[PDB]
Structures are given as C-alpha cells and as structure tokens.
Design an enzyme around this catalytic site. Structure first.
Site, PDB file in Angstrom:
ATOM      1  N   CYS A 298       0.781  -1.214   0.000  1.00 25.39           N
ATOM      2  CA  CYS A 298       0.000   0.000   0.000  1.00 25.39           C
ATOM      3  C   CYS A 298       0.814   1.266   0.000  1.00 25.39           C
ATOM      4  O   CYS A 298       0.249   2.368   0.115  1.00 25.39           O
ATOM      5  CB  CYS A 298      -1.033  -0.001   1.125  1.00 25.39           C
ATOM      6  SG  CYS A 298      -2.136  -1.450   1.114  1.00 25.39           S
TER       7      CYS A 298
ATOM      8  N   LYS B  49      -8.955  -0.660  10.028  1.00 26.12           N
ATOM      9  CA  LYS B  49      -8.701  -1.722   9.054  1.00 26.12           C
ATOM     10  C   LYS B  49      -7.806  -2.794   9.688  1.00 26.12           C
ATOM     11  O   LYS B  49      -6.623  -2.551   9.927  1.00 26.12           O
ATOM     12  CB  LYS B  49      -8.030  -1.153   7.807  1.00 26.12           C
ATOM     13  CG  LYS B  49      -8.029  -2.095   6.613  1.00 26.12           C
ATOM     14  CD  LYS B  49      -7.466  -1.407   5.379  1.00 26.12           C
ATOM     15  CE  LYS B  49      -6.839  -2.406   4.422  1.00 26.12           C
ATOM     16  NZ  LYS B  49      -7.328  -2.221   3.028  1.00 26.12           N
TER      17      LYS B  49
ATOM     18  N   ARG C 215      -8.041 -10.095  -3.455  1.00 27.75           N
ATOM     19  CA  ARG C 215      -6.695 -10.313  -3.977  1.00 27.75           C
ATOM     20  C   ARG C 215      -6.753 -10.748  -5.442  1.00 27.75           C
ATOM     21  O   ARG C 215      -5.814 -10.535  -6.203  1.00 27.75           O
ATOM     22  CB  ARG C 215      -5.979 -11.389  -3.152  1.00 27.75           C
ATOM     23  CG  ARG C 215      -4.465 -11.275  -3.171  1.00 27.75           C
ATOM     24  CD  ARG C 215      -3.982 -10.257  -2.150  1.00 27.75           C
ATOM     25  NE  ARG C 215      -3.622 -10.885  -0.883  1.00 27.75           N
ATOM     26  CZ  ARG C 215      -4.030 -10.457   0.307  1.00 27.75           C
ATOM     27  NH1 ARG C 215      -4.816  -9.393   0.394  1.00 27.75           N
ATOM     28  NH2 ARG C 215      -3.653 -11.092   1.407  1.00 27.75           N
TER      29      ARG C 215
ATOM     30  N   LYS D  30     -13.435  -2.108   8.739  1.00 25.76           N
ATOM     31  CA  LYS D  30     -13.300  -3.285   7.865  1.00 25.76           C
ATOM     32  C   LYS D  30     -12.268  -4.246   8.417  1.00 25.76           C
ATOM     33  O   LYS D  30     -11.159  -3.851   8.781  1.00 25.76           O
ATOM     34  CB  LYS D  30     -12.936  -2.816   6.459  1.00 25.76           C
ATOM     35  CG  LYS D  30     -12.200  -3.726   5.526  1.00 25.76           C
ATOM     36  CD  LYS D  30     -11.661  -2.938   4.337  1.00 25.76           C
ATOM     37  CE  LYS D  30     -11.443  -3.823   3.124  1.00 25.76           C
ATOM     38  NZ  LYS D  30     -10.472  -3.206   2.179  1.00 25.76           N
TER      39      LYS D  30
ATOM     40  N   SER E 176     -14.758  -9.035   0.839  1.00 19.76           N
ATOM     41  CA  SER E 176     -14.849 -10.161  -0.067  1.00 19.76           C
ATOM     42  C   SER E 176     -14.928 -11.490   0.681  1.00 19.76           C
ATOM     43  O   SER E 176     -15.759 -12.339   0.357  1.00 19.76           O
ATOM     44  CB  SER E 176     -13.646 -10.179  -1.021  1.00 19.76           C
ATOM     45  OG  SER E 176     -12.443 -10.384  -0.296  1.00 19.76           O
TER      46      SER E 176
ATOM     47  N   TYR F  19     -21.067  -6.020  -1.559  1.00 17.80           N
ATOM     48  CA  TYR F  19     -21.191  -6.602  -2.892  1.00 17.80           C
ATOM     49  C   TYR F  19     -22.608  -7.147  -3.099  1.00 17.80           C
ATOM     50  O   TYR F  19     -22.967  -7.581  -4.188  1.00 17.80           O
ATOM     51  CB  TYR F  19     -20.180  -7.744  -3.062  1.00 17.80           C
ATOM     52  CG  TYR F  19     -18.747  -7.274  -2.957  1.00 17.80           C
ATOM     53  CD1 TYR F  19     -17.984  -7.535  -1.828  1.00 17.80           C
ATOM     54  CD2 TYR F  19     -18.187  -6.497  -3.964  1.00 17.80           C
ATOM     55  CE1 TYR F  19     -16.680  -7.081  -1.727  1.00 17.80           C
ATOM     56  CE2 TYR F  19     -16.892  -6.031  -3.867  1.00 17.80           C
ATOM     57  CZ  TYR F  19     -16.143  -6.325  -2.747  1.00 17.80           C
ATOM     58  OH  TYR F  19     -14.852  -5.855  -2.662  1.00 17.80           O
TER      59      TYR F  19
HETATM   60  C1  LIG Z   1     -10.543  -3.346   0.893  1.00 19.09           C
HETATM   61  C2  LIG Z   1      -9.522  -2.686  -0.019  1.00 19.09           C
HETATM   62  O1  LIG Z   1      -9.536  -1.276   0.134  1.00 19.09           O
HETATM   63  C3  LIG Z   1     -11.640  -4.169   0.252  1.00 19.09           C
HETATM   64  C4  LIG Z   1     -11.392  -5.658   0.431  1.00 19.09           C
HETATM   65  C5  LIG Z   1     -12.594  -6.475  -0.009  1.00 19.09           C
HETATM   66  O2  LIG Z   1     -12.467  -7.710  -0.113  1.00 19.09           O
HETATM   67  O3  LIG Z   1     -13.662  -5.877  -0.247  1.00 19.09           O
HETATM   68 ZN   LIG Z   2      -3.677  -0.734  -0.444  1.00 18.21          ZN
END
Ligand SMILES: *C(CO)CCC(=O)O
Ligand SMILES: [Zn+2]
Ligand SMILES: *C(CO)CCC(=O)O
Ligand SMILES: *C(CO)CCC(=O)O
Ligand SMILES: *C(CO)CCC(=O)O
Ligand SMILES: [Zn+2]
Ligand SMILES: [Zn+2]
Lengths: 340, 340, 193, 340
Positions: free
Chosen positions: D143, D210, D220, D263, D290, D329
């Site tokens: 990052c 986070k 990923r 998150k 995800s 999602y």
């Molecule tokens: C976070 C990245 O900024 C999102 C990860 C995901 O699986 O939604």
């Molecule tokens: Zn990043």
C-alpha cells in the site's frame, strides 16, 4: 446460663448472594479479568563490560551481573522455557568510563549495545527492551546532565537521553524504556526516533509513574547507581503524589508513549488502577522492583509467607490492578510454575 | 572516538513541565490528597479470657494477648500518646468454651464484652470497635455455622452473627466490624441494630473487601483461628476477583454499612481505589494485616528496607489509594513518629 | 391453550429443572429459555434449596433469533411446532431490548451471562462488557456460525485454523472471557503450539 | 414415578417484563435503532484498463472486472433500482504500468480517473467514492512507498497518497477513502485538499479501523494486490488490537476525516460499537469484505443458511452496531429486496 442467641431474619435477598460465582476452583479463574501467561513476563538483564563476568548481586537474590560470554548459556534455558522478552541494563565497570554527560551510555562497545547485537543474533526471537538513562554512566550517578549547582538540566539531559534511545534502536533494540523521569523526555525521544526513521519499529515504553521510595535497594548494588549529593526526589514522584502521577501518565501518553510502566508495583497498585483508566488504550507494565522482590524472599525465609504463593498473589495483583505486562526477577520461576 | 551525542531539541512544552509542583519538601505535603494524623489510627487488641494474661504472639512481633487486668497499664501510655480508637478481638482459652454455634461469642463474661465494659469505664474517650465473627468461638474454627457437610449455613450463620453484633452494641461498643464475609450479613446486622434501637448510635464498619491469601499468618497464632477441614476460599474473595469485590462493596453499602474495610491493604491498593469511587461517600479503612506487618519487620531485619521509612511509605499509600482510616499494629509507633 | 408461552407455569417449571440439576450435582445452570423473569425464580429456587452458594447462574441474557441455529436443530431435535421462536428470542435489531435484558438478568441473580450468537453479535458483547462489567461474559459460537466456518474453509474461502482464531480472539476483544465452542477439541491442540 | 415438578413462584415483577415490546412484526422495526434504506448502500466497482473488459472474479461471486465501455450498461439498471453511490477500485492490467511509486495511481488515462469522468457525465446523480491506495499500482504490491529494506516509508508514502487523493478529487470524485492505514495520511490528504481548494467539496471517508485477517481473499483476485515479501501486518491493525483501533479512530477524526470505515465488518462489530461512541458525530461505514461476502455464499450453498436471510441479519447487524452506511457486494440484491 448464657445460651446462643439467634435473631429473627428476613428472606434472603438475591442481591446479597454473590457466593454462586466463586465456589469452585475453576471459577477463581473465570473471575479473573486477566490470566497470567508466559509472554507477559519481562526478565531484567544486568550486562557487565567484562565478557566473562557472572557475579552474584548482594541485595539481589539469584540475580547476577553477566558478561556477553556468559549470556548464551544463561538465556538458552530461559528461552526454551518460554521467555519472550528482556530488559537490558548496562553495568560498565572499566575505569575512566563514566563522565558528566554519560558518554558511555550509547558506546557501541558498551555492554548494552553489545548485548543487543549478541541477542539479536543468537536469539532473534527474543523481544529486546532497553532501559534508557544516564544514572549508570554519569560521574555523579544521577539520571541526567546536572547544572553547575547540582540540579538536573532538562534541556541538555533530554537532548542526551534522546540520542541514547535512538542509538539503542539503531543498534537493534525493539523497545526503549526511559527511566529518567525528566520532564518532556518522551517527546524528544519520539521525535528523535521519527527523525531517525525508527518510530514505526520502536516501541516506547515509558516509566510514566516512577515513585521515590525505600524499595530501590538491591538495584543500587546490581547497577551501582549511588546518587552523589542530594536526593533523587527531584524527578522521582513523591509517594503521596497521586495527582502528579496522573498528570505524568497523561503527559507521557500524549508525548508518544506506546506503553507505560508503573514502578514500584505492589506498593503502588492504586496507581496501576489509575493508569488503566487514563491509559486504557495502552499496555500497562508493572515493575516488581528489587526492594519488593527482596522483601518477598526475606519474609519467605522468616517463614512469614510462602514464596511461590505470595509471588503468585502479588503478580496476579498486578493483572487485577490493570497491568498486562510484568517486569520481574521471578520470571525464571514463573516460567516453571506456569507449566503446572 | 565515541563521543557524547546531543540531539536537536525543540522548545520545552509547558504541558511537559510538572517539576514545579514538587521541588520542595513542603510541596511533598501539598501534593498529598490526604495527610496522616493520629485519629486515623486504629490499634487492634487481642483480649484473653485470662485477666492476668499478657503473652507475646509468635508470628506477631511486639503484639501480645492481654487479659483485662493488664489492659489499663497497656492502654494508658497509648491513649496519652493520642490513641483514639481500638478494635477488639476475643481469645477465649478456657476449655469447653467453644462450640458449633459460637455461643461464647457474645458471652457477657467473655473477653470481648469484658473489655468493652472495662474500656468504657477507664477510657470513656476511646472509640470502641469490635470485630464480629464466630471463627474464634466455633469448634471448627470457621467464621460461621456450618451445614452437616461442612459448608457454611448463611441463614443460621447470619442469624447468629446479627445477635452477636447487637449484643456487643448492647454491651457498649460504638462500632461493629463483621469480618465473616457471609452473603447478606450486613443487612441482618443493621436490622437487628434497628430493632434493638441501637442503629443510630452504632457505626457499621463492614469488611466489604476481604480477600483470601497468604498474609493472614500471624493472626492465626494470636487469635488461634485454624480452619478445620477445607479452605476459607468459600467466603473470602479470590485474589483476582475484582468484579466480585466491586459488587460486594456496593452490596454492603446498600445493606447499611457506614464505612468499609479493605483487607489486606498494601497488596490490594487497587481495590481501595475502586472502593473510593463506589463508596465515595463513606469512610474507607485499610487493614494492615499480620502478614503484611510481619513482612515489613522481616525485610527490615534483613536490611532490605528501613522500618520507619517503609512503614510510612505503605501507610501513606493507603491514604493515597483513598483510605482515611487505618487499622495497624504499627499504631504505637506512629503515635510517636507523628509527633516529629 | 392458544400456543403462546405461559411465563408463570413455564418459569415455575424451569426453576424446578434447574434446581434438580444442581441437586443432581451440576456446578452451573444456563437457562436458555429467554422467558421473562426466569432468572429470579431460578435464583430463588436455588436459595430455597440451599444451593445458591454453590451453583453458578450463567444466563443466556442476550439470545437473538436468527438463521444460525441450524445444525443444533439436528443434534438436539428441537423443531418448533407452529409459529416462530421470535416470541422470546430477541429480534436481531433489538439492541435496546438486549441491553435491558442484560441489566435485568444481572439484577435477578445471574453470576455470568452468555451472548448468542457470537460473531454476528460482537457489538452486543461490547455492550454487555459495560453493563455487566463485574460479571464474566461468555460467547456462544453457535452451530450455524461453526458450520459456516467449516463450509467457507471447504470452499477454500478461508483457512479453518486461521479464521477459527480470528473469530475466537474477536470474542475476547469484544469483552468475553469465556467461550462455548465446538472447536474446543481443536483449540486444546492449537493452544499448545 | 417421576412427575413434573413446579416450584412456588412469587408475583411477576414488572421490571422482568420486556416481552410487551417485541410481540408483533411491526415492533421488530420499532425496536431497531436504524432501518435499512437504499441510499445507505455503496457498491464497489473494479475498473480495468481494458475498455471492453468484463471478466468474472474467481473468489468474488457475481462480481466482475469491468472496462469503461461496459460500465453504462452495467450501472443503468442498478441506478434505476435506487443506487446512489459507488466506490471505485482501479485495476491496470497493461504491462509496464506499475512501478515503485505507484505513478499510475493518478494516471488521468487510468481506469479510476477514466471511470470518474465517465460516471460524472452519464450518471451525474451518483455519488462517487474512490479508494485511495498504491497497492494496486506498485511493483511490490504494498500500500505504499517502501524503504530499501522493504518496510513502508511513511513520509514519501503519505506524500504520494495525498497527491493521488487530490488528483482524484480534481478529476471529479466526490469522496476519497484512503485504505492505506499509514500513520498520519489523513492529515496530509486533508491539507492537500485544502491547498487545492477542494476541502469544502470532498468528503474524507477514512478506513480508520482496518484489521489484518483471513477475510481479504477474493479481493486479492479482483484487484490483483498480492504483497511481495512479508506480511501486511505492519500497517493493518492486529485482530486483537482494540486499543490501537480506538486510538486510530480518534486520530483520523482529529486529522480531518468526515466519516470512517470499519473493515472487516461482521467479525469486527464490537469495533463499530466503539467507533459509534468515539466518532459519534461522524457517519460510520461498514465494509462487508470479499471474504465475509464469499463466506455467506459458501455457507448458503452448503445449505448451512439462507442467503437473503443471513444477508439481512449481517447487514442489519452493521446498523445495530452503529453504522449508517454500508459498502457491500450484495448491494444489487438489496436494491431488489428493499422493495418488498
Ligand atoms: C478493501 C480494499 O480497500 C476491500 C477488500 C474487499 O475484499 O472488499
Ligand atoms: Zn492498499
Ligand atoms: C529501575 C531502574 O530503571 C529498576 C529498579 C529495580 O530494583 O528493579
Ligand atoms: C482479620 C481478622 O478479622 C485480621 C487479620 C490480621 O492478621 O490482622
Ligand atoms: C443454543 C441452545 O441452548 C445452542 C445452539 C447451537 O447451535 O449451539
Ligand atoms: Zn537513571
Ligand atoms: Zn472469622
């Protein structure tokens, strides 16, 4: 004839009944806000400038002054027992080493930095903590650079301390613990670390609440830090100074401390409780000083109490008061006890 | 050549400067939330059923088991020194005196009630506190009336304890201190006092936070209260039980306690801090138990610390943690020390 | 007669059951009924049976109705007959009710409390940690959550040991100090390394 | 014969009765501190550098990698269904695009900025949120800008991130969401926005909390952000780090964040509860990662739970824990469900 009298009682109130929560041995554990584990212990180490050193400290039962050449055989068993962290204390015995500005403090050839390099290579899994001060490196024996009159010189002192801490980190220490107690030293140490690009890998464990008392005995022998003219009651918090302790805790946290140390421990359990609220988001460490440690051994010897028992009561008192880390000379023992 | 390094420092932040508040000896006092005074001390008294008694307790240095006939010559100097309160503990040695319901507990001819009558006449200015329990009067040695299995019987126990407390008050005791720890005993004691029309003249000082530990040693000798089969960990709070301690404090207060006692003291300073918030409106008393008291003497003897010094540090720790009253065996000493 | 629970008779019965378990030798009783005021009657029954000082009362103070009680319906064979259990079980969004139930049960004599489900109700554990700060809090990793981890692990969505550790240490983070889980056998191994 | 036993009960206490508040379906709604609405949903978008792209992500069921040329036909139905906001994620597939300083991050010709311009013209009513990071644009995959050793370089990193965020805003993004987690990035981003005269029109939605875990799987694949040598546990909060999370929340808020993101979500509901108190005056957003999303689908497939049901339970859990915004999602689905 005098006979047993029984008063008329009312039905038991549920609010009176607490016994249901600690009637079983397992419940004693469930009732603990925090349980004692091996990775919570931090064993102190007194490194001498004599590589083959291994002298027993008078006032410090079962504790010795070791040289680098004896470290390995000394740490091996402890590490295998579960030791995860150590706090280094330098003990330069070579003549002409001490001076007015604790120059030897960050001597790359000194015991501290030599010990860091040694541990980082033979025990890369051990967490290395370094006490940060100049008491053991000054000609006077005080924790900092004194003015001409004798009183500490904050500016020069903190300026020096910051250099020392940064150099320890540069040498490879994971954490620095400034035990000076000089106003504003945490800020300068944090800034130095930031400027050295080490602030993201160096944990700053400040002795935020360090009180002056009658329990620093044994350490004076092991470390050889006898004050020269005057009392250390100039920086060390007064035993009754709760307000000051609370303000120092808040100050150090705001200055960048990642964790704080309360010392002494047992005799200052209420202060740990205060730190647990003020520094609720930071790890709190209890320091079972030489005097308290020696006090337990003494009382045990006089059959006043059982060592293992009282050792457990006192330590679990630290956790109860809010600490989640413990610097103690009883670590070797606990590494055994925690197995059963 | 390794030379002293000094980092570039920023201007001192005022928020860092705390030193201005404790640089002078007088400031050490100003910094104390509470100062130690003579009327804060409560000397324990172990009254024997032998009027001419005056035996020295083993495990209790400088403390003896006195009979009524020796009280006067023993209290005279202490009272003249400023003693204002005492806490009576009965020690019936006569055979066939103990039983399953601690009948002898409120025996008008017993040591406790005899001592009250004696003190009320020869020292009408002394504040008389009486510990309330059945441990020293039961055949088993426990603090209450046991079921057939051996576990305490709350109902009968508290029923008995309430009678004892009321009888002590009827005898002339100004205050009662139930050290049983049996759930709901404070409520029944308060009710008994109310029914006896003594609730307005009897202070109820509850041992709200009494922990089980390794520091009750010496007392077992002086009081001769050896538990019979099993551990006292049934009523006495577990060393790690902070939550339970907090609930017991709230419970006892709500049940009528006018003040509370935290015992042990030093090893439970954080608990005193908790009580200071929960029971902020009530006087908090610290009990420097036999084990802690003997521990200081032991360490002093081994030259680990100075008696007067550590005695002061520990006691002023009680005040710092929030206590405003102290039950200690070092009272006689403090009555001297507080003069200088 | 209509089908809705009868608090009075129900709690009266539940108290008997709890006391009998204690009489049999159980150290602790965990009323998972969720019927209003059952803790008080159970505590009273224990007091009257002279077992209140040896019996720990671990109440399911925060038991929510949801889609995670699956597997248990098989193992225990407890299929509701006509209607939903949403009569006693807290509504998933009922935070206010959960907070009041926690306070109620504590005041009624609970020595500890259980939050179930766990993972999907971590915020509730956080609430209980403040309200019931002086009592031990227990997290119940229900069958549905447990099966959900296994399912996801099988589909290579996550690693069992890893996610098992993340979820459990989440319970401790949220304030719990006790955990009822079907992954115990595994942890008894893992905690060794 | 064993017969049903019924204990003697006391009259029902009103304080015990809570059932009157949730006995009806409507009451289930009244009992909710916050109800789920369409404008609370934020659909993630993975824009590829291939205009005709539209590949399905492995680990991300029903989610694809779209090119600008397919956006319109993809967003049209969603927007008509009530979608009000989207969060853009760039996925540059063209070779030689990535480098050591994430140069391509703010490439005006890149997917992100291209998507902003596209959405601003075809859907001027959609709220455009842009994730801010360099992970998907660096040669290493981390990052930020790494030192020579491999560890992040805060100074250069944040310096770069601030530029990227400002450029996204300059391109037309309404909001920026820095998911880097690098210390102090919010302050620099806010300052950059202020200097670019965009601070009054750009909402700063920081990923304040986070955590590092096992739920970032699918992403990923969709984003193609595989770390190169080492763990992301250098910046990402440790799963047990509640204290750090609380401090990060306070820090980011004080640094200018207008809202915060937690998150993962479900597995960190207690953290949302903490943020609701610390950041009580700011909107809190939950990110259904995800891994959690895929976990629900997996369990549903194995008949362990019902997708719609558990989707609702989990989401309404976010609102219960204090969130008032949700990045998921499952948005497309909810846009349907919320209609019934
Ligand atoms: C976070 C990245 O900024 C999102 C990860 C995901 O699986 O939604
Ligand atoms: Zn990043
Ligand atoms: C404190 C010096 O930093 C340690 C004193 C001791 O006796 O352990
Ligand atoms: C407590 C009995 O009530 C006193 C114990 C001691 O040693 O002082
Ligand atoms: C709750 C019944 O008391 C347990 C449900 C489960 O699936 O574990
Ligand atoms: Zn020093
Ligand atoms: Zn007793």
């Amino acid at each position: 004839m005098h006979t047993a009298e029984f008063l008329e009682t009312e039905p038991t109130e549920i609010s009176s009944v607490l016994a249901g929560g600690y009637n079983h041995p397992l419940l004693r554990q469930w009732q603990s806000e925090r349980q004692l584990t091996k990775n919570m212990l931090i064993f102190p180490l007194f490194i001498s400038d004599n590589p083959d050193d291994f002298t027993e400290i008078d006032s410090l039962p079962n504790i010795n002054r070791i040289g680098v050449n004896r470290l390995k055989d000394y740490l091996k068993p402890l590490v295998a027992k579960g030791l995860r962290s150590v706090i280094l204390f330098g003990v330069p015995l070579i003549p002409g080493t001490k001076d007015p500005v604790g120059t030897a403090a960050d001597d790359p050839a000194g015991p501290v930095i030599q010990g860091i390099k040694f541990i980082r290579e033979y025990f890369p899994e051990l967490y290395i903590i370094c006490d940060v001060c100049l008491c053991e490196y000054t000609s006077h024996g005080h924790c900092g650079v004194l003015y001409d009159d004798g009183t500490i010189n904050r500016e020069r002192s903190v300026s020096r301390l910051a250099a020392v801490a940064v150099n320890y980190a540069k040498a490879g220490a994971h954490c620095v613990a400034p035990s000076d107690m000089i106003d504003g030293r945490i800020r300068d140490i944090k800034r130095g670390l930031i400027n050295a690009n080490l602030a993201h890998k160096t944990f700053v464990l400040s002795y935020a609440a360090k009180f002056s008392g009658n329990l620093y005995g044994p350490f004076r022998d092991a470390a050889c830090s006898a004050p020269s003219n005057g009392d250390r009651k100039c920086y060390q918090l007064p035993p009754a100074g709760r307000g000051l302790a609370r303000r120092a805790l808040e100050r150090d946290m705001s200055e960048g401390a990642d964790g704080i140390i309360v010392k002494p421990s047992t005799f200052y359990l209420d202060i740990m409780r205060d730190a647990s609220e003020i520094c609720k988001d930071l790890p709190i460490c209890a320091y079972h000083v030489s005097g308290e440690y020696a006090m337990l051994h003494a009382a045990a010897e006089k059959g006043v109490v059982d060592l293992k028992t009282i050792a457990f009561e006192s330590h679990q008192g630290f956790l109860r008061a809010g600490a989640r880390l413990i610097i103690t000379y009883l670590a070797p023992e606990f590494l055994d006890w925690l197995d059963e």
